[PDB]
Ligand SMILES: Cc1cn([C@H]2C[C@H](O)[C@@H](COP(=O)(O)OP(=O)(O)OP(=O)(O)O)O2)c(=O)[nH]c1=O
């Protein structure tokens with residue numbers, strides 16, 4: 001017996017069912033490309049169940065008694081076990097719609113809605129996009145300019161080098177300010193599509209105006225290819241960057257997300273930003289459905305009492321929701 005919510009079970013970085021989960025996640029992704037959010041969540045949940053299993057699924061009798069394994073997901077696994085291939089998955093992979101949506105959505109600054117609009121307007125290739133620059137935001141233009149580098153997986157060695165330059169810029173700008181690696185790398189992943197950093201200072205308010213000073217310093221060093229600063233609107237101050245990472249004899253563009261949070265909200269921001277996306281979806285669903293509380297990256301709110309939970313750590317937040325603590329490396333749902 002394995003719990004239904006991904007936030008109630010450990011999901012390690014590496015598991016025994018990568019072929020099966022990858023097939024399900026292709027179907028999940030394709031459903032998201034078509035706007036079928038329910039079907040996406042269904043396939044994603046089924047894939048995450050396989051990730052938590054302690055052993056490989058070699059016979060279909062091993063699916064018996066597992067949550068989130070309805071008919072469609074079971075059939076996928078069945079065809080894979082019996083034939084080594086699932087024809088729906090292979091049709092999806094080869095389809096022009098999926099390949100194009102995948103191409104466009106992996107461009108920096110392009111979501112599903114934009115990608116689908118461009119598809120419907122007869123755009124197919126990266127060159128087609130380049131021929132219509134009036135259709136692109138500045139962020140999207142930067143993404144296209146650097147798309148080869150931005151499609152190259154980011155390595156832990158890249159992350160280490162980047163964290164050093166970000167730490168130096170932060171340390172110079174404001175003594176005492178801290179940089180915390182979040183995102184998939186904090187969950188132990190060995191590769192990723194970007195690097196995520198969360199910046200704070202232990203005195204509430206000392207972080208005001210820090211990010212722009214950090215960016216000035218990084219810019220002066222030649223380390224920034226693209227930078228979009230956004231002030232908090234509703235809602236953290238952040239900078240969407242492409243860094244020019246020096247390498248032995250060349251350089252690579254790398255996506256970096258810098259997020260500033262006031263230290264009061266830091267444990268919520270850390271939790272939210274550490275992911276995985278599905279784990280956080282599941283944790284927020286759990287908080288709302290099971291405990292009546294709204295969790296987001298800024299706080300945990302009781303909307304009946306009209307109160308906010310004070311947390312000093314991620315552990316406090318788990319405790320408050322009635323969940324066993326999961327370290328970041330077990331949140332790979
Ligand atoms: C869009 C959004 C994401 N997040 C979270 C969810 C993600 O788990 C987390 C990091 O985003 P990413 O950098 O997209 O995801 P990742 O680091 O888990 O994986 P990858 O290797 O592909 O980079 O940010 C928020 O907290 N608030 C938001 O508004």
Ligand SMILES: [Mn+2]
Nearest residue numbers: 183184194196
């Ligand atoms: Mn990331």
Ligand SMILES: [Mn+2]
Nearest residue numbers: 194195196257
């Ligand atoms: Mn990111």
